[PDB]
UniProtKB/TrEMBL annotation:
Coiled coil: none annotated. The lineage of its organism: Bacteria, Pseudomonadati, Bacteroidota, Bacteroidia, Bacteroidales. Ca(2+) binds at residues 5, 7, 109, 112, 251. It comes from the Bacteria. Cyanocob(III)alamin binds at residues 25, 27, 117, 151, 160, 242-244, 246. GO terms for molecular function: metal ion binding. It comes from Bacteroides thetaiotaomicron (strain ATCC 29148 / DSM 2079 / JCM 5827 / CCUG 10774 / NCTC 10582 / VPI-5482 / E50). Keywords: Calcium, Metal-binding, Signal. This is DUF4465 domain-containing protein. The chain holds residues 50 to 305 of 305 of the full protein.
Length: 256
């Protein structure tokens, strides 16, 4: 058995100066981290790269960032919904850990963890692609730990607005659900199996699921996985698809 803990990855890969992760984008003046991995590009255990969508390579195109952030509250100077905004996208929501900011030992392992962003639905499927990672060779994927991001936790709990018209509704109110999917692929890129996990559920007397507030184990036991994709499904979905921020944090991936 091995565990990918993220804690030993190159610091140069850590998301942006602040918890907005300004270096996850081409255009904000920082060396942009498109690619994370454990050792070198030559010999790695794990590797994710940002997708390219309409010729543009960005965290929004779907991918996985390395983070050591755990802010879940308006820091000095921030107001309104800031702590569950995209300007704190990189933060894990972890209530088991009193101090908040950068390397505050808030992973299921140390300070570090992956932040998954992206999803595909009927509205964006023509252009968008799912976040993905790879093993260097096919592996038994035993399981992994997960936790919500402050952004996702917040918007589930309170909703928000975004852009001119965008509305996200609290899931308690509209009897909503939100789910993450872990899709395992084989050595030839064949789908082995898709794994589902409810992050929240308040549907009709369905077992109610409240969002986790600390790291929670996800048993998989998939054989011969070369690569993994993530998607999100949820019922908070209008004219332009899913409104709930399509993010999850990941730590301590166990393999053999
Ligand atoms: C297309 C799209 C969409 N996006 Co963008 C995505 N992917 N997005 C984009 C693109 C914008 C379009 C463009 N430049 O041409 C694109 C790829 C740049 C983008 C970017 C972002 N987006 C992001 C997110 C998280 C989201 N996006 C959605 C709005 C998400 C949408 C899904 C949805 N249900 O809305 C979405 C699929 C459709 C928007 C649309 O046309 N609707 C029309 C409407 C919302 O108002 P509008 O004035 O016509 O639309 C504008 C804004 O919505 C704005 N916009 C788009 N995304 C966001 C996100 C935020 C936080 C804000 C404040 C504005 C935007 O772009 C639109 C065109 O100007 C989102 C609901 C998807 C999701 N379920 O995760 C979600 C917001 C969650 C929430 N409740 O707040 C990013 C933070 C992703 C990231 N990891 O970086 C990022 C923020 C900007 C950046 N730093 O690059
Ligand atoms: Ca870790």
């Amino acid at each position: 058995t091995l565990t990918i803990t993220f804690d030993d990855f190159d610091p140069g890969m850590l998301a942006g100066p602040t918890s907005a992760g300004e270096n996850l984008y081409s255009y904000q003046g920082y060396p942009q981290v498109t690619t994370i991995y454990d050792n070198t590009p030559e010999e790695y255990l794990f590797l994710s790269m940002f997708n390219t969508v309409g010729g543009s390579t960005e965290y929004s195109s779907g991918g996985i960032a390395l983070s050591n952030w755990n802010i879940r509250s308006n820091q000095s100077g921030n107001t309104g919904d800031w702590w569950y905004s995209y300007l704190n996208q990189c933060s894990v929501y972890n209530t088991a850990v009193e101090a908040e900011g950068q390397n505050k030992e808030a992973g299921h392992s140390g300070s570090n963890f992956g932040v998954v962003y992206g999803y595909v639905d009927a509205y964006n499927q023509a252009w968008m692609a799912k976040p993905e990672f790879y093993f260097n060779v096919p592996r038994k994927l035993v399981g992994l730990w997960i936790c919500n991001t402050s952004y996702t936790y917040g918007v589930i709990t309170y909703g928000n607005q975004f852009g001119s018209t965008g509305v996200a509704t609290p899931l308690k109110e509209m009897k909503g659900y939100f789910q993450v999917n872990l899709e395992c692929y084989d050595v030839n890129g064949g789908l082995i199996r898709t794994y589902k996990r409810l992050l929240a559920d308040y549907r009709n007397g369905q077992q109610q699921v409240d969002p986790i507030t600390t790291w929670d184990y996800w048993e998989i036991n998939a054989e011969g996985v070369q690569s993994v994709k993530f998607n999100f499904e949820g019922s908070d979905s209008g004219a332009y698809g899913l409104n709930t921020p399509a993010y999850i944090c990941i730590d301590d991936i166990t393999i053999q």
